[PDB]
């Protein structure tokens, strides 16, 4: 390996290279200027970004001596053996020659010294502290460390003279992902149909080793494809194809979000009949910030992110969420209404923090708050409470959606059939700014939804859905679904009884118009008039708030 | 035990076979294509699916060196010795041959390293993290892991290089269940009248570790029958009877009617005895419910040919004492889908957010062992209209009903779970749960008519001696407004 | 004592109870008076700490089981007897329940508590037994 | 160094500390500088061991046993002053503490001048919380 193998990081690689080379390649300049540079460096960031890879690259390209210390290798059973081990390591590093000390997984040896309760670990960390600085502490040997939880280190060990510089090997951007892809495809033979730039543009949250995993999967698919047919004829002319890469991309997800992978659901914009204007509005809301960044910063304004669906139940809010989940390049995080609450104290806010941190880590990401009124309701209304845990939760949501954040691409979709129960602090612009009313379908919308549900069903040639759409007046999407289901059920009954009659000693290849006619007798309006009046009043009150325009 | 004894998961079996065998059988392919294969697998799924069995098969079949690591086997008293044990295991694996490392029950030595507070677990986790992926990480050794809950694992371990891919060994299906039954009934002495396809059909939520239980129970019944017929034979069993044991269909049917899926062992309902002939009247409702619950399960092929998903929900409302709970008992008795019964205010708890946890747990138990019929008696308690109460008990009722809302129809995987509701005050149920897709059809159960009353009287008097000359038509005429309870 | 034996260490309070029972059975037929069992018997359903359930199970195993007790009796004490395991109020563990809650008893206690001191000649104990009508003893 | 007072042989740490302190006292009116007292001051509650008891008690006994003619004083440097064993803080062993606080703007300028007096040069008002 070498510096050419590491990719996706330029500034961090430059900092490490200078701090490791200039001290041991141009030392006369350091005494000429007078002041020595920082002597310790701490690599931190999410897992699988290139920390140990960077350490290996430094050990390879640099001709100086190298000594590696894994996390818990230092400490053993015998009393004082851990400190003896550190002393031996440092002495052998300093005695022979200029050397680089790399301690892997430092967080396993340096607790905070205030929350720990053991004895040996405290003595070990104090040994490390006194060994790094003091009289005859360190002479012409540089120290390297890698960690995944930088906050889990005692601050006393993270001052100048011990670890002066902290380098953040963070998530790569599109260019970094492209560089990593080019690096990992340098050895395998690849077909001409590939388009690496678009592929990198599609891996919207991948980091480091995840790209390598994608490459490995795309390779494995070909071996399992060009093996059913069976010699040197197959050993050559492999030619990893673009379809293999697309397939491997379709399955794998970023390692950060592996905990919260949503179960596969299959729908499409053709499946969501009606709501064409709302569909296009959502497309231009969700895709423009991600697909056209440069022109976005050309105007110098941030994107608009939040959105709330509100309307009568069984109209398609969750269906729209499913469509966005399955047919958008951005990552998806499905969150239920009360799924985040917990019995313990403060764990609900911890779970909310973890969810939003996972979301913004692998940006762009979409978070779908299902039945938002469950966990984001009016503040102070509850007289008898559990210590105001719900109030704290809604306050946590308020701070997390808009506050002391980095303004990364994280879109929140809220779905609730009860909008008056949401606190006004969430409905403000900046958290959930545009409130989309999802009304009951009209006649053309009824025809569209009926066709969308029946896009897969075989029907008679003379059958027309216009009469069904015209007959229903106050119906919603779920009611038309029920009509279709009843018709299919009656068709199944006819099929099975005909099959039994034939077996007594495809009779129904289609669903007849008679089945729809006699399945519509039990049809009903799910949404009563009271809720329709209430939602219309809510919309009219929203419009009435605006005035003089 | 070989590879021909693990049936039900062919895809996962081949998927593991790929990296465990092919890079050792034919190493030319990977050097030809230029990339190394994955060397990390995490087997997860509900208990009793074949994870340890598959590990045994891999160990027995492959010629590579095998090293077994039990989960809590590593711990020692001295500080820094568990990691010493890990070092000895991995160094032996690397020093000897191209080996396979199987870590059984890895969730007990791999927590998140952030919620735990003990020092030894953090240090051992860091040791494992460095051993799998660090400097000069691994030389042609593949690591296998098994767990019952994957979410309680360190995220740093669920990465390429450490655990490349996670295989999901889940609940089998009809073909898988038939394969398991064939495998487990290949060494025993069956009768000539036994058929397995019907037996594999009638078994619904069995995870594959319950099929072996079914076979063992059938064998135990056979021996019990042949030891009841023959004398106990204290000294020595006669050899002639051993020549003919067999196992009839009745033994399997009896064992099937006793056993239940291991996932539903906590929620087993007491065996009540109601039959379709015990419920008089309501013939149209009885047939409608029978078809609505039977058509999606036995004949999925037609439903998929019509490209529409079956109807799930159903609600019963009417005056008290008309047969709603009786219909629920009748469904629970002689229908083939699994049954989960809950009373009205049974899933409520003192703690905050625990009621929703219970709802999640019961609906997960229902979805795992599908098809399943969930009976919610007295819906008015758990699904009362939300927002009506000016006062509140902390808003818990709103949260529980919302959980029900988005657990019966939300961002979840569609599966065969039917919800039967029973109430005597439908007006105080939120409309959001009465729409199609959650509770499709709302059935009314009126007070019985003359013919219905006569049929009800006959249904109650199946096993009652009466006078030959007693006529019940006058009784039916005399009431004119009664219910079944009267 | 109740609070004394309970600890935060894992597998220590159970060891303490086992050592206590071994000591009691070792020397001679003895009487074990375990005070305030309600603090270490939370009914196993309303509790959340695992140490409480573990010590409850240890107590149950010590009182009843294979060669549980050999000529040694145990006495308990509590203010609220309801907050105890039903398994502990069984026969073989706490088969007998005694209610230790009047004027004559109060007078007897007054007489026995003033036996070792010559108070006076004109002190009448009837007024004391009638005026101190709410004294436990 | 605090964490360097233990040893491999059984109880050989006590001999090491004893010979160290007696050599420091017997030679001359020297000055002894003790690092990381927090490493040897866990409040007596979070120890649960025996080596700490012996070594700390030995240090207490030896610190108490200091004749006036020794003319030797110890200087301690603790970064966690509230996590100190009060037994060590009693009068006659360690009575006077010094609150080494945050420097002022003038102090920041002074340290800046001190550090920059060994480099080729071609701030104390924006630098506020910086210390040392």
């Amino acid at each position: 390996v070498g510096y050419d193998d590491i990719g996706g990081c330029r500034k961090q690689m430059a900092q490490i290279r200078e701090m490791v080379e200039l001290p041991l390649r141009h030392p006369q300049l350091f005494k000429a200027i007078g002041i020595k540079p920082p002597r310790g460096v701490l690599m931190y960031g999410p897992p699988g970004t290139g920390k140990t890879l960077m350490a290996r690259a430094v050990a390879n390209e640099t001709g100086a001596f190298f000594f590696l210390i894994n996390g818990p290798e230092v400490m053993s059973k015998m009393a004082g053996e851990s400190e003896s081990n550190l002393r031996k390591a440092f002495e052998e590093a300093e005695k022979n020659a200029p050397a680089i000390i790399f301690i892997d997984e430092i967080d396993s040896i340096a607790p905070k010294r205030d929350k720990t309760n053991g004895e040996v670990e405290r003595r070990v960390v104090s040994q490390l502290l006194t060994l790094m600085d003091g009289m005859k502490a360190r002479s012409n040997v540089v120290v390297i460390a890698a960690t995944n939880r930088p906050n889990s280190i005692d601050p006393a060990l993270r001052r100048f003279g011990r670890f002066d510089r902290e380098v953040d090997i963070g998530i790569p951007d599109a260019t970094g992902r492209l560089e990593v892809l080019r690096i990992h495809t340098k050895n395998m033979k690849l077909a001409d149909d590939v388009d690496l730039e678009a592929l990198a543009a599609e891996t919207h949250g991948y980091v480091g080793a995840d790209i390598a995993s994608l490459c490995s999967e795309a390779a494995m698919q070909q071996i399992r494809e060009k093996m059913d047919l069976i010699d040197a004829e197959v050993l050559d002319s492999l030619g990893v194809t673009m379809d293999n890469f697309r397939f491997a991309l379709g399955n794998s997800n970023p390692s950060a979000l592996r905990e919260t992978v949503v179960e596969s659901v299959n729908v499409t914009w053709d499946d969501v009949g009606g709501l064409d204007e709302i569909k296009e509005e959502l497309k231009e809301t969700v895709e423009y910030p991600v697909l056209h960044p440069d022109q976005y910063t050309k105007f110098g304004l941030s994107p608009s992110k939040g959105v709330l669906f509100y309307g009568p139940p069984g109209t398609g809010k969750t269906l729209l969420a499913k469509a966005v989940a399955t047919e958008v390049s951005a990552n998806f995080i499905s969150v239920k209404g009360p799924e985040l609450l917990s019995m313990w104290y403060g764990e609900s806010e911890s779970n909310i923090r973890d969810i939003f941190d996972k979301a913004r880590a692998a940006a762009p990401t979409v978070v779908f708050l299902d039945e938002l009124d469950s966990i984001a309701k009016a503040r102070g209304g509850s007289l008898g409470d559990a210590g105001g845990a719900s109030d704290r939760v809604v306050n946590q949501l308020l701070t997390e959606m808009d506050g002391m954040n980095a303004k990364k691409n994280v879109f929140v979709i809220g779905a609730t059939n009860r909008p008056d129960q949401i606190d006004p602090a969430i409905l403000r612009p900046g958290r959930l700014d545009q409130l989309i009313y999802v009304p009951l379908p009209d006649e053309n919308a009824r025809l569209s939804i009926l066709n969308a549900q029946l896009r897969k069903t075989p029907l008679e040639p003379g059958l027309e859905l216009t009469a069904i759409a015209k007959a229903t007046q106050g119906f919603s999407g779920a009611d038309l679904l029920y009509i279709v289901q009843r018709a299919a059920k009656y068709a199944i009954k006819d099929s099975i009884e005909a099959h039994r009659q034939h077996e007594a000693e495809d009779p129904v290849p289609y669903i007849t118009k008679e089945h729809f006619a006699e399945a519509m007798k039990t049809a009903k309006r799910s949404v009563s008039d009271a809720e329709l009046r209430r939602y219309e009043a809510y919309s009219q009150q929203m419009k009435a708030s605006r005035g003089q325009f | 035990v070989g590879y021909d004894d693990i049936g039900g998961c062919r895809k996962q079996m081949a998927q593991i076979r790929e990296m465990v065998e092919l890079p050792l059988r034919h190493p030319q392919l990977f050097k030809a294509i230029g990339i190394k294969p994955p060397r990390g697998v995490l087997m997860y799924g509900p208990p009793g699916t074949g994870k340890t069995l598959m590990a045994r098969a891999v160990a027995n079949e492959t010629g590579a060196f095998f090293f077994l690591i039990n989960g809590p086997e590593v711990m020692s008293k001295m500080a820094g010795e568990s990691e010493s044990n890990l070092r000895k295991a991995f160094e032996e694996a690397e020093k000897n041959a191209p080996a396979i490392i199987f870590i059984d029950e890895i969730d007990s030595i791999a927590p998140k390293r952030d919620k735990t507070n003990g020092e030894v677990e953090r240090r051992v986790v860091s040791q494992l993290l460095t051993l799998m992926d660090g400097m000069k990480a691994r030389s042609n050794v593949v690591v296998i892991a098994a767990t019952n809950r994957p979410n309680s694992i360190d995220p740093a371990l669920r990465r390429f290089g450490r655990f490349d891919r996670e295989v999901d060994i889940g609940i089998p299906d009809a073909t898988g269940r038939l394969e398991v039954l064939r495998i487990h009934t290949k060494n025993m002495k069956l009768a000539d009248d036994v058929d397995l396809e019907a037996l594999a059909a009638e078994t619904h939520g069995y995870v594959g570790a319950d099929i072996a239980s079914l076979c063992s129970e059938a064998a135990m019944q056979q021996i019990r029958e042949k030891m009841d017929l023959i004398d106990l034979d204290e000294d020595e069993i006669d050899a002639e009877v051993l020549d003919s044991l067999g196992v009839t269909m009745d033994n399997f049917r009896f064992a099937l009617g006793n056993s239940n899926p291991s996932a539903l062992r906590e929620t087993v309902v007491e065996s009540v005895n109601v039959t379709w002939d015990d419920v008089g009247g309501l013939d149209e409702i009885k047939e409608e419910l029978k078809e609505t619950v039977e058509y999606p399960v036995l004949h999925p092929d037609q439903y998929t040919k019509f490209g529409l998903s079956p109807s799930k929900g159903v609600l019963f409302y009417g005056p008290p004492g008309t047969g709603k709970t009786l219909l629920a008992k009748a469904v629970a008795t002689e229908v083939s889908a699994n049954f989960i019964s809950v009373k009205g205010p049974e899933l409520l708890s003192m703690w905050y957010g625990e009621s929703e946890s219970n709802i999640r747990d019961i609906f997960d138990k229902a979805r795992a062992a599908a098809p399943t019929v969930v009976f919610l008696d007295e819906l008015d308690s758990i699904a009362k209209a939300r927002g009506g109460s000016l006062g509140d008990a902390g808003g818990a009722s709103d949260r529980v009903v919302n959980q029900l809302l988005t657990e019966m129809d939300g961002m979840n995987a569609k599966k065969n779970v039917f919800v039967i509701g029973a109430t005597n005050r439908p007006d105080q149920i939120d409309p959001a749960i009465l729409r199609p897709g959650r509770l499709d059809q709302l059935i009314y159960v009126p007070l019985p008519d003359e013919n219905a009353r006569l049929s009800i009287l006959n249904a109650q008097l199946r096993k009652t001696p009466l006078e030959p000359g007693l006529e019940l038509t006058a009784i039916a005429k005399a009431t004119q407004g009664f219910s079944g309870a009267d | 004592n109740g609070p004394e034996v309970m600890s935060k260490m894992a597998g220590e309070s159970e060891s303490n109870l086992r050592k206590a029972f071994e000591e009691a059975e070792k020397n001679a037929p003895a009487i074990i008076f375990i005070d305030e069992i309600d603090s270490i018997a939370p009914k196993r359903d309303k509790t959340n700490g695992e140490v409480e359930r573990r010590v409850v199970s240890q107590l149950l195993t010590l009182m009843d089981g294979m060669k549980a007790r050999s000529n040694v009796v145990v006495i308990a004490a509590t203010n609220r007897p309801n907050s105890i395991d039903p398994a502990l109020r069984r026969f073989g563990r706490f088969d007998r329940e005694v209610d230790i809650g009047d004027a004559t008893g109060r007078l007897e206690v007054l007489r026995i508590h003033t036996k070792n001191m010559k108070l006076a000649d004109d002190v009448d104990l009837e007024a004391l037994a009638a005026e101190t009508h709410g004294y436990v003893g | 160094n605090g964490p360097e007072v233990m040893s491999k042989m059984a109880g050989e740490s006590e001999s090491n500390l004893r010979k160290a302190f007696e050599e420091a006292e017997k030679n001359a009116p020297a000055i002894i500088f003790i690092d990381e007292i927090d490493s040897i001051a866990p409040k007596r509650d979070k120890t649960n061991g025996e080596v700490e008891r012996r070594v700390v008690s030995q240090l207490l006994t030896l610190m108490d046993g200091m004749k006036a003619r020794s003319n030797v004083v110890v200087i301690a440097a603790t970064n966690r002053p509230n996590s100190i064993d009060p037994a060590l803080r009693r009068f006659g062993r360690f009575d006077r503490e010094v609150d080494i606080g945050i420097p002022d703007a003038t102090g920041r300028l002074e340290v800046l001048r001190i550090h920059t007096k060994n480099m080729k040069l071609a701030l104390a008002a924006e630098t506020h919380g910086y210390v040392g």
């Binding site: 015998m78 009393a79 008898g384 559990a386 | 008293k77 030894v120 905050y352 | - | -």
Partner: peptide, 23 residues
């Protein structure tokens, strides 16, 4: 020679309960 030993017993958590108000 002497030897060390590790020990990690337990900790203490806090729960939250819900109450019902009768106005």
């Amino acid at each position: 020679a002497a030897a060390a030993a590790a020990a990690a017993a337990a900790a203490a958590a806090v729960a939250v309960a819900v109450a019902v108000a009768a106005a």
